[PDB]
Design a protein around this ligand. Structure first.
Ligand code: HEC
Ligand code: HEC
Ligand code: HEC
Ligand code: HEC
Length: 107
């Protein structure tokens, strides 16, 4: 039961830095991004040691770091998923929300 920190949070652990402001995501259940782990809401690094440490281009599974922030066929929502369920009305933003290059995430 913390307090939505002030914007200015960016994730760049891998070879792809992606900024994310809670402001642009302050209308979503914290439980959407911060899923309950070991039966206890977790708000620590998504990756961290012990959790999503998998950082390869192939191997999937829940351990998959890029699989917990892309794939939509997961237990929990991702980043591209929600975006997919959103950027599915126009074939324009689809190249921005789910875009690979020039996208807000991978801009
Ligand atoms: C177009 C469909 C996409 C391609 C191709 C890739 N993504 Fe993303 N992406 C996002 C985040 C938040 C991360 C993790 C940041 C971090 O942990 O540092 C990533 C990471 C990747 C990676 C690296 C995975 C690895 O470590 O091997 C690859 C290869 C990758 N992404 C390819 C965020 C987003 C995002 C925001 C909504 C979108 C639309 C996409 N990613 C889409 C693509
Ligand atoms: C995705 C749509 C998110 C929602 C919804 C909320 N948060 Fe979040 N938060 C998110 C990320 C990607 C990160 C950084 C992790 C990373 O990959 O680097 C965070 C970080 C926090 C933190 C920092 C951890 C700490 O020091 O305690 C806190 C405290 C936090 N977020 C709080 C929070 C609250 C209260 C939310 C609902 C009101 C909430 N987050 C939603 C992604 C997302
Ligand atoms: C260890 C304390 C973890 C941290 C930190 C994060 N997650 Fe996680 N996640 C963890 C486990 C043990 C599992 C598997 C249990 C399950 O619900 O299947 C997961 C699963 C996910 C998934 C589902 C992927 C699938 O294949 O179904 C996603 C999409 C996911 N986790 C995303 C995610 C995000 C966005 C995180 C940071 C806010 C995050 N996880 C942190 C353990 C841990
Ligand atoms: C629904 C539960 C979402 C999840 C999960 C994530 N995002 Fe998201 N994002 C969502 C919406 C509805 C929007 C607004 C799109 C619009 O302009 O109408 C966004 C926007 C972004 C942006 C763009 C910033 C902006 O234009 O204000 C970025 C860069 C972004 N989202 C990144 C992002 C990341 C990194 C996520 C996982 C950590 C993520 N989103 C999850 C809805 C949802």
């Amino acid at each position: 039961a913390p307090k939505a920190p002030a914007d200015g949070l960016k994730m760049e652990a891998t070879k792809q830095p992606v900024v994310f402001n809670h402001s642009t995501h302050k209308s979503v259940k914290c439980g959407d991004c911060h899923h309950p782990v070991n039966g206890k809401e977790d708000y620590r690094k998504c990756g961290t040691a012990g959790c999503h440490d998998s950082m390869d281009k192939k191997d999937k599974s829940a351990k998959g770091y890029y699989h917990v922030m892309h794939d939509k066929n997961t237990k929990f929502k991702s980043c591209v998923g929600c975006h997919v369920e959103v950027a599915g009305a126009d074939a324009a933003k689809k190249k921005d929300l789910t875009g690979c290059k020039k996208s807000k995430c991978h801009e």
